[PDB]
Design a binder for this molecule. Structure first.
Ligand SMILES: N[C@@H](c1ccccc1)c1ccc(-c2ncnc3[nH]cnc23)cc1
Lengths: 337, 20
């Protein structure tokens, strides 16, 4: 059963949570190939592990930049959580380490690129296409939430497509293990629940709201709340009104009304029956949840492949150096990393 | 159209996280 699987998953997780792996490789064991993404919150690089020739995605954070952004605790969260999890639609840490300058997290490489890239190019996904991805998110959240983890940054930019067309939920920079309410203003404007915008204490229900935004954007091709500036976006989100495209099915509209629900007592995922309100909704009627988890379902789209370590599904970013100071930076701040 | 309005907007690229 589901409850049995999750019980065992939690036991596996907690052992790694209470005794995190630390300093399990070194930069010089990897060959840097290409920058896969970059921004103020660090970068992800394709690297080759020398001893095996395996390819990995390596997230690199500059410790000093982390400190300036006040993301020390959040970064320790990300590493501590990712080294402890194990799930078909997550990329756990294979290795992690740090040097004088940077923090490194090495995980499975997904060569199909960001969902964001394909969604924008293709324009929108068909409902069955959207549903295939949504299913994997539903299961991943069921997993994370059962471990008391809140994810807090669902978006196409943080969803990677693997060689078989399945998804990896990446970017755990705002992920937190919390049993009660929490208060941090974080996320991405288009995906923020009303609770967050209005500076209330919130819980894992914000992830289920975020799922509503994702499913909408996947099926529509644009988000349900968009504008040129974040402030105009927040006004729309709190307003309590959403418009659906005429091509949206009845079932899709109804699922979304129940996900994009300002009222926490009625928002799907949050209620007495939990995730089963979502799993048992008419829109997911054709969804074989075990087949999704088992990866037996045929993906409606598979990315173009041309070999191992191919990067054609990713954009091109300017390659910056990986600089390592001769002096140790922020040692005490990141001692547990 | 809503699509036209989205595509003409300044937020069709990769969206950054926010924070305090
Ligand atoms: N969301 C991006 C990104 C942009 C700037 C900084 C950090 C992250 C992104 C996330 C993950 C990957 C990634 N690609 C491939 N394989 C992976 N495994 C784990 N993450 C990835 C690529 C870009």
């Amino acid at each position: 059963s589901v409850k049995e699987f999750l019980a065992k998953a939690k036991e596996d997780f907690l052992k790694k949570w209470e005794n995190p792996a630390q300093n399990t490789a070194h930069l010089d064991q990897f060959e840097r190939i290409k920058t896969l993404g970059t921004g103020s919150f660090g970068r992800v690089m394709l690297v080759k592990h020398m001893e095996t020739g395996n390819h990995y995605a390596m997230k690199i954070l500059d410790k000093q930049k982390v400190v300036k952004l006040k993301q020390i605790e959040h970064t320790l969260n990300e590493k501590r959580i990712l080294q402890a999890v194990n799930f078909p639609f997550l990329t756990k840490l294979e290795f992690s380490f740090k040097d004088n300058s940077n923090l490194y997290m090495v995980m499975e490489y997904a060569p199909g690129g960001e969902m964001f890239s394909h969604l924008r190019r293709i324009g929108r996904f068909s409902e069955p296409h959207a549903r295939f991805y949504a299913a994997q998110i539903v299961l991943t959240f069921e997993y994370l939430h059962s471990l008391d983890l809140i994810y807090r940054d669902l978006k196409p930019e943080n969803l990677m497509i693997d060689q078989q067309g399945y998804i990896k939920v990446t970017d755990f920079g705002f992920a937190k293990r919390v049993k009660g309410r929490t208060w941090t203003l974080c996320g991405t404007p288009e995906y923020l629940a009303p609770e967050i915008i209005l500076s209330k204490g919130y819980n894992k229900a914000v992830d289920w709201w975020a799922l509503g935004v994702l499913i909408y954007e996947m099926a529509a091709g644009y988000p349900p709340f968009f504008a040129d500036q974040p402030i105009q976006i927040y006004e729309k989100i709190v307003s309590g009104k959403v418009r659906f495209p005429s091509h949206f099915s009845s079932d899709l509209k109804d699922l979304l009304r129940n996900l994009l629900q300002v009222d926490l007592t009625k928002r799907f995922g949050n209620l007495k029956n939990g995730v089963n309100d979502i799993k048992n909704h008419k829109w997911f009627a054709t969804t074989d949840w075990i087949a999704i988890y088992q990866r037996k379902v045929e993906a409606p789209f598979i990315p173009k492949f041309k070999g191992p370590g191919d990067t054609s599904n990713f954009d091109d970013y300017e390659e910056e150096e990986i600089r390592v100071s001769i002096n140790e930076k922020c040692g005490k701040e990141f001692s547990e990393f | 159209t809503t699509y036209a309005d989205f595509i003409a907007s300044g937020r069709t690229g990769r969206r950054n996280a926010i924070h305090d």
